[PDB]
Design a protein around this ligand. Structure first.
Ligand SMILES: OC[C@@H]1[C@@H](O[C@@H]2O[C@H](CO)[C@@H](O)[C@H](O)[C@H]2O)[C@H](O)[C@@H](O)c2nccn21
Ligand code: NA
Ligand code: NA
Length: 434
């Protein structure tokens, strides 16, 4: 596997949340999420990544006019993450195109960009079913210019991304731009969509972003319907005009149809197998790119939930993939119920992991009181390997074999170690002091 790298050249293992669905409907475009909430997340789980929801409606409230005050608010939030050592992926999020699909249900595009052409959008028993209503299908068909009537929409979209990238190009905490949440092709589905207008939009948007930001990873998703459930993607390679090596990453989601016992469990397990094979294939097509699992999640109160969650994280680890769990929002899917009570997720996610490795991590494992990591060395890297250790399992000092301890910060929970680069692959083993 391939990895995103920090400015020190260290390979990043990214663990965090989507933050947050509450931003979708907020007049000011911000999530119901405070700096204190982030402090809690970090204290409880030691996360180092966020998929932070932004929106086209908030960036470009009128055609060609970008809201710099909205971008100020996003920058403020990114600052909270920066202060606690997080890396940020900005997600241009939509579901069912826009809030403008009914006089609420959807989110994303501004009203001026929403052309349903008077076609109906009748109430449906599940939010996902709004995708196939005539007005929503038309809204997307117009956006992709399948209708031939709105070539301007993708152009506006690309330049709205350019505006965001112009603001965040020199932001040390931002590592990735996730160009579109769950692309939906309307009347176009499969390879016709993904290799056609979807790829074309990604290319135009990448090109626009690269007018103002040369180093942030541009993250592209397959179409969500089908691919979320373990079907292959027909997405094609996107060219990165930046000088030097490509910085494109692949950011699919994982949502098995059964969702965890009986035949449902078997179906979900083979879904993971299928999803892994397809994800690896498309990551190769795109240029042997890094993978970020941009969303997965479920109601943690379902029997078998922990086993599913642990299997997904094991699979991500084996694939060298980042993970942003859906989502930090209050409720049984998330780490906290509305009153602040921890769900099963906190203890499940709160495990040691390498955050930033001085070399390629070839394999690693962890339990509550042990971490082992093997590193393919890189003599050019001078920064130490940086590792999270939860206080539950590591209440005092550390015992490290295979590396020299550089620092052990018992407050931030960050262990830093140093390994040789001229001795082949190095295995580091971390256990609690006796
Ligand atoms: O349904 C859970 C999530 C979904 O959030 C869901 O979006 C819906 C529509 O905005 C909201 O009503 C829900 O409150 C929210 O949890 C993600 O926006 C989407 O990318 C996805 N794909 C699969 C699952 N999910
Ligand atoms: Na409109
Ligand atoms: Na950056």
């Amino acid at each position: 596997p391939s990895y995103l790298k920090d400015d020190d050249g260290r390979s990043l293992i990214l663990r965090g949340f989507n933050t947050a669905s509450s931003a979708k409907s907020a007049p000011d475009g911000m999530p119901q999420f405070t700096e204190a909430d982030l402090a809690r997340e970090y204290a409880d789980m030691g996360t180092n990544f966020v998929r932070f929801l932004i929106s086209w409606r908030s960036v470009e409230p009128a055609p060609g006019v970008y809201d710099q005050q909205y971008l100020d608010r996003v920058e403020d939030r990114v600052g909270w993450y920066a202060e606690r050592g997080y890396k940020v992926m900005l997600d241009m999020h939509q579901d069912v195109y826009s809030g403008a699909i009914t006089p609420a249900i959807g989110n994303g595009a501004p009203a001026w960009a929403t052309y349903m052409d008077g076609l109906p959008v009748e109430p449906q028993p599940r939010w996902e079913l709004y995708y196939i209503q005539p007005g929503v299908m038309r809204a997307f068909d117009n956006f992709w210019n399948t209708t031939g009537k709105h070539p301007e929409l993708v152009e506006h979209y690309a330049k709205a991304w350019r505006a965001v990238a112009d603001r965040f190009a020199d932001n040390d905490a931002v590592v990735a731009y996730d160009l579109m949440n769950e692309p939906f092709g309307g009347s176009l589905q499969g390879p016709a969509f993904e290799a056609g207008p979807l790829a074309a939009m990604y290319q135009r948007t990448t090109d626009a972003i690269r007018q103002v930001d040369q180093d942030t990873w541009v993250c592209v998703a397959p179409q969500a319907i089908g691919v979320n459930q373990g079907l292959p993607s027909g997405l094609t390679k996107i060219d990165d005009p930046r000088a030097g090596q490509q910085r494109i990453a692949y950011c699919p989601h994982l949502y098995p149809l059964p969702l965890h016992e009986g035949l449902a469990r078997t179906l979900t397990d083979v879904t993971i197998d299928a999803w892994r094979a397809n994800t690896a294939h498309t990551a190769r097509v795109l240029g042997d790119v890094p993978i970020i699992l941009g969303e997965f999640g479920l109601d943690t109160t379902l029997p078998g939930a922990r086993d599913y969650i642990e299997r997904v994280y094991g699979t991500a680890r084996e694939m060298g993939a980042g993970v942003s769990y859906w989502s930090s929002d209050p409720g049984p899917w998330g780490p906290y119920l509305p009153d602040g009570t921890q769900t099963l997720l906190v203890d499940t996610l709160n495990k040691p992991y390498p955050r930033a490795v001085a070399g390629t991590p070839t394999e690693w494992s962890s339990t509550s009181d042990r971490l082992q990591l093997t590193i393919e060395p890189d003599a050019a890297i001078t920064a130490p390997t940086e590792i999270y250790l939860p206080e539950a399992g590591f209440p005092g000092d550390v015992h490290v074999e295979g590396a020299d301890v550089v620092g052990w910060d018992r407050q931030s929970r960050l262990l830093t170690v140093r390994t040789p680069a001229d001795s082949g692959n190095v295995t580091v083993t971390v256990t609690p002091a006796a």
